[PDB]
Design a protein around this ligand. Structure first.
Ligand SMILES: CC(C)Cc1ccc([C@H](C)C(=O)O)cc1
Ligand SMILES: CC(C)Cc1ccc([C@H](C)C(=O)O)cc1
Length: 580
């Protein structure tokens, strides 16, 4: 009878409110925390009233009609959300589409600083207000965040403040936990944003293609019907989360985790650990599980996909199924490839059949189809080897700067804080992936790139500035990284006017932590490239090294400001000469 009641019964009071908190935070990102808790409570109260009397007035309304309605009751809508008010004129699902469109990928809120004893204080005072604040903060900063997974992280967050607040040294145990948690939030948010961007830009078939490749790798011992079934369910789960259908999304998630754990013996040996765990941890561990060992009975593949005389008929008869099988098969045996790579291979396979099967002797034509995969494989392998050598030689910061030069050359219209955030995330991929066993480096690298590039496409959606960026972001999901790789120096670009103040430094910088000092330098670097786009990376490395030296000297000076003031302008002009 009543959807609200149903979700309520299923989910429980705790998680139900949790996800309603997240839903709302993600929808209306600028509302005070208070205004959200009261909305959650109100809706939760209605839910209880429905759970007890499902016939009751309005209980039978859809979830979206009910949330939409509550979000439209919110204080100062037109002033606070001028765009959002128009959404309230509209009924469901129109209304919801409207909220979604008008969600903010870059709200640039205050950085979350963990003040350990001020928050340990608030935590003891009221643990529930404390954790719910964290859900709010995190949800509004990452409005497409995997909702269920946030509740999970919010629990780790509890366990941090639980195991650190009584401990005599607060900061020392707390600050690195919280920093690690933030690393994890950011990565998680980027995996999920890539999921939702794919639904929105490429659709369901593309998301399933991605899932089939990835789960085939993760569960190489599960047979095709089983991979199919999981992917079908998983896709549905992320589709609902991506449309803000969070309650529905959590319930389907629980069911799918129950399912996978019923069947774990025909899915993967690695699940055991995850199945002996409480609900949220189990879902998390399934989500993050490592690839199983490859089975000894993997079938040769030449027979079915290359030598068989009937391939065109099967391909013509059941396209998505045939290809699906191929992809399952090629991916089970290739944990050593990025999902992108597998998807590219699958397209070249499809494209070999369309070609061959319209010809005279198709079997003579498709007999060599495996051999077309070779150049697809070597190109990323090189990328990863070459960029890992560089990284191993010069370390994160230099590697980041190399990437900032690269990106600013390709898209000098993008704003400096974007190119710096990107270049930096891209170099963190070095840190993450290059250290790994060699056969692991390609998938780590390209899987991680897909996240940063998608983060770029997302920003570029809001603030479009380069056609070269639009084309890469919109032509093909599987071709994105290669399309990006291939951009050179935009030569239609007109160097940005020189503004000396931008390269002029002051004593303020000296009191910054290392992370932040780099950011200011790295920003100058982008700006150096904007003004001198034909300067080589080597030339810029030397200029910036000149800049670092000067910042370090003046920071260690008696009179930091006079040092900056005397030396800075000479360095600013002479450095222009170094970038011819
Ligand atoms: C259901 C889904 C797995 C079918 C399917 C199979 C292969 C492909 C690749 C990306 C292609 O476009 O050739 C897409 C979709
Ligand atoms: C291996 C990886 C960590 C280094 C790296 C960083 C960025 C790029 C982009 C796609 C480019 O080359 O344009 C490739 C490789």
């Amino acid at each position: 009878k009543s959807e609200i009641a149903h979700r309520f019964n299923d989910l429980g009071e705790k998680h139900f409110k949790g996800l309603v908190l997240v839903a709302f935070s993600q929808y209306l990102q600028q509302c005070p925390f208070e205004d959200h808790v009261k909305l959650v409570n109100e809706v939760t109260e209605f839910a209880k009233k429905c759970a007890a009397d499902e016939s009751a007035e309005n209980c039978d309304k859809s979830l979206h009609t009910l949330f939409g309605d509550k979000l439209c009751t919110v204080a100062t809508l037109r002033a606070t959300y001028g765009e959002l008010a128009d959404c309230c004129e509209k009924q469901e699902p129109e209304r919801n589409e409207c909220f979604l469109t008008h969600k903010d990928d870059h709200p640039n809120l205050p950085k979350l600083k963990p003040e350990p004893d001020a928050q340990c204080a608030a935590f003891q005072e009221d643990p529930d207000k404390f954790l719910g604040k964290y859900l709010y903060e995190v949800a509004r900063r990452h409005p497409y965040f995997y909702g269920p997974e946030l509740l999970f992280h919010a629990e780790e967050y509890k366990a941090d403040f639980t195991e650190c607040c009584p401990a005599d040294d607060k900061a020392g145990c707390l600050i690195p936990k919280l920093d690690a948690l933030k690393e994890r939030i950011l990565l998680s948010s980027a995996k999920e944003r890539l999921k939702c961007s794919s639904f929105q830009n490429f659709g369901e078939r593309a998301v399933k293609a991605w899932s089939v490749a990835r789960l085939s790798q993760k569960f190489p011992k599960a047979d095709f019907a089983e991979v199919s079934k999981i992917v079908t369910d998983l896709t549905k789960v992320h589709k609902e989360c991506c449309h803000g259908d969070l309650l529905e999304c959590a319930d389907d998630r629980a069911d799918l985790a129950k399912y996978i754990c019923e069947h774990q013996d025909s899915i993967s040996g690695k699940l055991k650990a995850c199945c002996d765990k409480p609900l949220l941890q189990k879902s998390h561990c399934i989500a993050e599980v490592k690839e199983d060992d490859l089975p000894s009975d993997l079938p040769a593949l030449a027979a079915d996909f290359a030598e068989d005389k009937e391939i065109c008929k099967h391909y013509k008869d059941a396209k998505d199924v045939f290809l699906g099988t191929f992809l399952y098969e090629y991916s089970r045996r290739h944990p050593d490839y990025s999902v992108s790579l597998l998807l590219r291979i699958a397209k070249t396979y499809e494209a070999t059949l369309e070609k061959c099967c319209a010809e005279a002797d198709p079997p003579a034509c498709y007999a060599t189809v495996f051999d077309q995969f070779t150049p697809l494989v070597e190109e990323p392998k090189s990328l990863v080897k070459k960029n890992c050598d560089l990284f191993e030689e010069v370390g994160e910061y230099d590697f980041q700067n190399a990437l900032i030069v690269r990106y600013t050359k390709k898209a000098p219209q993008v704003s400096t804080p974007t190119l710096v955030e990107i270049g930096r995330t891209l170099g963190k991929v070095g840190s993450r992936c290059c250290k790994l066993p060699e056969s692991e480096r390609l998938p780590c690298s390209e899987n991680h790139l897909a996240l940063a590039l998608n983060r770029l496409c997302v920003l570029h959606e809001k603030t479009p500035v380069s056609e070269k960026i639009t084309k890469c972001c919109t032509d093909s999901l599987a071709e994105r990284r290669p399309c990006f790789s291939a951009l050179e120096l935009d030569e239609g670009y007109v160097p940005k006017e020189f503004k000396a103040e931008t390269f002029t430094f002051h004593a303020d910088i000296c009191t910054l932590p290392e992370d932040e000092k780099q950011i200011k330098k790295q920003s100058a670097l982008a700006e150096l490239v904007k003004h001198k786009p034909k300067a080589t990376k080597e030339q810029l490395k030397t200029v910036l090294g000149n800049f670092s030296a000067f910042v370090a000297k003046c920071c260690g000076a008696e009179d930091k400001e006079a040092c900056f003031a005397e030396e800075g302008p000479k360095l600013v002009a002479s450095s222009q000469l170094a970038l011819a």
